[PDB]
Ligand binder design. Structure first.
Ligand SMILES: CC[C@@H](c1ccc(O)cc1)[C@H](c1ccccc1)c1ccc(O)cc1
Ligand SMILES: CC[C@@H](c1ccc(O)cc1)[C@H](c1ccccc1)c1ccc(O)cc1
Lengths: 9, 222, 212, 8
């Protein structure tokens, strides 16, 4: 899930 | 951190974290959804950044942050739609350059029943004269609440927002009785926002050219 | 509409429906049979809810909230039975299930939430009444809508009455009020999800066809 | 509709 990446950056 | 702020500091943080009103490109069944999915996709990117600026959200586990966003994303989209459609009765302001009416909803099948509930919620916010400081509180509540039973820290942050809501009403001249009644009235609307989201989610899965993120959100409700 | 909050509670408590008694295909038959007989009692209970008979609207409110009212009743019955759901005194089921295994957990979660909050019966009957009047109020005419809000406001006052007469501070009253009503949002969720899987007497389908 | 009759 790309949502993990957005929430970390 | 969120626990240790004043009700005024809570409001100011929420108001400052507010996402901007995006525009759409410059109908039919494929074109309508296209503009909506495109708008929603760009809104979600801002929402994720807004979520991280909501007091006590970063203090959660990343997995928990994903869970709450995936469960509430359409609610948050809808309550934002409803809010900025207040000053346009009978119409839904998706974007400043995308104003739609009930008849225009008849292009996407099954979408007109959602539009009616959205207008009704909007006219309700109108009738209540919902304030912006109250709107940002409701939106933060939706984020933290909608996926909490699917925790101990979240319930304390929710209590903090409840304190903040009463603070706004007490600082507006409303009596104690009027504060309880308004608070109750606002939170009951959240039950309908949940209902609209569920019905909207249903029709989206019935249609599923959605993006990867928008499809990742929808698959969470599958 | 002109009842004291003590008289409000007394009316709702006295109007309470009784707790009725009752593989994969057999258990659905039990729940379907049970809910169908509960619906009969719910309708006559709804008639005893203050302000409900002052409407026409009644059909619509019940069609939208029937599964909610059934679920919050179930959750209320399972409150003192951790990890399990008390559908009937002779039907106590836990997690140990096709597709409603998720609903069970949400019901268990809701029941668990009622437990730690130490939900009172006086508060329960208020919430159940709220669900009845609220769930179908923005799907309507508006002459009745104004009256419904007045009744909703009255129940809100009644809720705050109870908490104040429990020793809770003014802030604790607001907080508990919020906590309670926020749960109704989850009940709406469970109802919609439960309504989804449902898609079997004539009445139970008349209610079921309304959410198609 | 069934719900109509029973309510009356
Ligand atoms: C009600 C409009 C939304 C919608 C949601 C579900 C549908 O089946 C039809 C339309 C919509 C939406 C969401 C996701 C995908 C498509 C459309 C949306 C909502 C608010 C907003 O600010 C931007 C778009
Ligand atoms: C949670 C169990 C209920 C249920 C509701 C929807 C489903 O897809 C699966 C189960 C069940 C139910 C309700 C309506 C129709 C069938 C099953 C029920 C709920 C409350 C109650 O007091 C008695 C039974």
């Amino acid at each position: 899930k790309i949502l993990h990446r957005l929430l970390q950056d | 951190l969120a626990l240790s702020l004043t009700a005024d500091q809570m409001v100011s943080a929420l108001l400052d974290a507010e996402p901007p009103i995006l525009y759409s490109e410059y109908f039919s069944e494929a074109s309508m959804m296209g503009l909506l999915t495109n708008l929603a996709d760009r809104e979600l990117v801002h929402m994720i950044n807004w979520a991280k600026r909501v007091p006590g959200f970063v203090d959660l586990t990343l997995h928990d942050q994903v869970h709450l966003l995936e469960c509430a994303w359409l609610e948050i989209l809808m309550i934002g739609l409803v809010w900025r459609s207040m000053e346009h009765p009978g119409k839904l302001l998706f974007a400043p350059n995308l104003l739609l009416d009930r008849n225009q909803g008849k292009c996407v099948e099954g979408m007109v029943e959602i539009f009616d509930m959205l207008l009704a919620t909007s006219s309700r916010f109108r009738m209540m004269n919902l304030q912006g400081e109250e709107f940002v509180c409701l939106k933060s509540i939706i984020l933290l609440n909608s996926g909490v039973y699917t925790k101990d820290h979240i319930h304390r942050v929710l209590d903090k927002i409840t304190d903040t809501l009463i603070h706004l009403m007490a600082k507006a001249g409303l009596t104690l009785q009027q504060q309880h009644q308004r608070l109750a009235q606002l939170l009951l609307i959240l039950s309908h926002i949940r209902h609209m989201s569920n019905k909207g989610m249903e029709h989206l899965y019935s249609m599923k050219p959605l993006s990867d993120l928008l499809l990742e959100m929808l698959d969470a409700h599958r």
